[PDB]
Amino acid sequence: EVKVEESGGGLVQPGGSMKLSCVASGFTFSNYWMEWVRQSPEKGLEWVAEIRLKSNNYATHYAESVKGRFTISRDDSKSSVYLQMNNLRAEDTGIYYCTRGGAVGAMDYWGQGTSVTVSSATTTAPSVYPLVPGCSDTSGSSVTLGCLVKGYFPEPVTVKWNYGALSSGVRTVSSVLQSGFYSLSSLVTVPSSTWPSQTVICNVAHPASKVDLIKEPSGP
Amino acid sequence: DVVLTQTPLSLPVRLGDQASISCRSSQSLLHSDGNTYLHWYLQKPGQSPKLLIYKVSNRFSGVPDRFSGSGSGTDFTLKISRVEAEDLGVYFCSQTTHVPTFGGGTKLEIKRADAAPTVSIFPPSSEQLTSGGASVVCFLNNFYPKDINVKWKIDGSERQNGVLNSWTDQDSKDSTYSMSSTLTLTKDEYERHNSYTCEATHKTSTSPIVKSFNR
Ligand SMILES: CO[C@@H]1O[C@@H](C)[C@H](O)[C@@H](O)[C@H]1O[C@@H]1O[C@H](CO)[C@@H](O)[C@H](O[C@@H]2O[C@@H](C)[C@H](O)[C@@H](O[C@@H]3O[C@@H](C)[C@H](O)[C@@H](O)[C@H]3O[C@@H]3O[C@@H](C)[C@H](O)[C@@H](O)[C@H]3O)[C@H]2O)[C@H]1NC(C)=O
Numbered sequence: 186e187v188k189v190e191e192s193g194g195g196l197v198q199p200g201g202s203m204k205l206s207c208v209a210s211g212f213t214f215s216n217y218w219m220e221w222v223r224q225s226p227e228k229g230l231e232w233v234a235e236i237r238l239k240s241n242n243y244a245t246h247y248a249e250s251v252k253g254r255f256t257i258s259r260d261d262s263k264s265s266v267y268l269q270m271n272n273l274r275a276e277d278t279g280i281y282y283c284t285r286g287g288a289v290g291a292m293d294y295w296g297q298g299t300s301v302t303v304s305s306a307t308t309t310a311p312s313v314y315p316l317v318p319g320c321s322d323t324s325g326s327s328v329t330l331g332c333l334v335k336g337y338f339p340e341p342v343t344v345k346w347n348y349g350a351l352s353s354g355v356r357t358v359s360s361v362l363q364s365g366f367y368s369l370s371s372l373v374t375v376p377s378s379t380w381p382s383q384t385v386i387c388n389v390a391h392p393a394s395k396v397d398l399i400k401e402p403s404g405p
Numbered sequence: 406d407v408v409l410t411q412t413p414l415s416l417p418v419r420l421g422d423q424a425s426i427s428c429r430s431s432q433s434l435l436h437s438d439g440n441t442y443l444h445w446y447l448q449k450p451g452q453s454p455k456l457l458i459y460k461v462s463n464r465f466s467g468v469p470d471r472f473s474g475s476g477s478g479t480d481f482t483l484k485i486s487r488v489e490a491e492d493l494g495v496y497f498c499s500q501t502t503h504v505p506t507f508g509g510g511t512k513l514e515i516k517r518a519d520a521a522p523t524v525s526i527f528p529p530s531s532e533q534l535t536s537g538g539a540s541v542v543c544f545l546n547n548f549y550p551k552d553i554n555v556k557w558k559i560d561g562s563e564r565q566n567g568v569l570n571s572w573t574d575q576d577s578k579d580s581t582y583s584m585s586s587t588l589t590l591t592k593d594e595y596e597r598h599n600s601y602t603c604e605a606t607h608k609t610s611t612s613p614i615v616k617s618f619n620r
Pocket of ligand 1: 436
């Protein structure tokens with residue numbers, strides 16, 4: 186069951202280097218061409234580069250906008266494909282996906298992606314505050330709780346509740362950029378009695394700072 | 406390169422109804438080997454894109470018969486009869502006949518019956534005070550359509566400065582949106598007032614939904 190997985194993203198300067206890693210499994214890796222497609226907010230989906238088979242001398246093909254700066258390599262023995270990126274620039278900002286060169290003539294399977302941000306701005310782990318009722322009468326489904334994530338940079342941060350075990354009625358708004366910093370909030374609605382007799386916690390992750398934040402809403 | 410333009414940009418459709426997305430290329434996609442490499446993909450909210458149709462009309466593994474692909478010269482189309490909840494997301498058309506390029510995308514939105522928001526208001530956490538600012542949040546849950554008006558009232562007087570509204574995507578299960586209005590004051594500003602109200606005004610009600618708290 187095809188599963189591709191990218192990694193190695195974060196914040197770079199205008200103009201540093203960074204290497205992406207992709208690990209595929211669930212198919213004879215050596216039998217397929219591998220791809221790299223980035224998705225910028227400003228330029229949608231953009232094919233970056235491709236690498237072919239061994240019988241192909243491991244031929245590579247790059248997108249005009251990255252010829253010379255990016256280099257795609259592979260390791261059939263490890264079922265991995267890499268993307269060395271040098272001389273990065275604002276324009277290279279975007280989510281990078283590692284896809285397979287399908288037998289059908291189309292990038293059939295994609296990874297979840299790994300974000301890359303080029304900027305002179307520096308990292309800032311997020312600050313997480315609790316969203317607790319505010320002492321009131323029960324008249325709104327049955328108990329809404331949340332975590333407010335502020336002052337972080339870059340993007341993104343992923344919020345999960347109870348390590349992902351709690352996944353029903355979770356609502357996470359979109360992040361907004363303000364004062365050079367992002368923020369958002371995630372909320373979940375639980376039954377009036379499952380809380381606080383039972384513990385609820387949000388799991389805020391911020392790849393760029395490599396930090397994972399765990400906080401539990403008690404009913405203060 | 407080869408440009409792929411998709412229309413419409415945004416598309417509302419009732420459940421069970423039909424929908425047609427078109428994709429036009431700047432040039433002929435017919436490959437020398439007589440194959441037209443035109444594909445369509447679906448990217449659900451917060452997910453990697455997925456292959457639906459390959460080579461104009463072939464459906465990929467696990468794709469329902471609901472998805473159909475046709476083509477004629479440089480104009481191509483994706484059809485979705487019996488549209489449903491899980492079909493919401495952005496649809497792309499791509500071509501690999503030449504240097505791979507993708508289409509701008511089309512946001513399929515599920516048109517459903519109006520839903521009344523469920524307001525909740527959270528006062529700032531003492532944990533935030535040391536940052537020098539206080540954020541009061543008003544959460545509008547499970548409502549349809551998207552549109553909504555939130556107004557804040559501090560000690561009666563309507564306030565506009567310091568507000569930030571942000572929406573969620575359409576929900577895959579029930580097709581409703583959620584939205585939070587955040588009011589951020591400075592530590593002291595917030596301590597010079599006591600009654601904080603927010604009034605929500607939706608299509609589903611003449612009288613604003615009002616939620617409030619006092620310190
Ligand atoms: C400028 O136009 C392109 O380059 C010219 C030099 C060439 O004459 C012209 O045909 C264009 O060819 C494309 O070149 C770019 C890179 O420059 C490639 O990225 C394109 O590949 C497409 O997209 C891939 C994701 C997809 O895997 C390709 O499909 C393969 O090749 C075609 C010819 C076969 O019909 C198809 O079955 C598939 O090949 C099979 O599966 C792969 C995994 C395996 O390695 C093969 O041995 C075979 O079993 C393609 O759609 C490239 N376009 C094309 C159509 O090749």
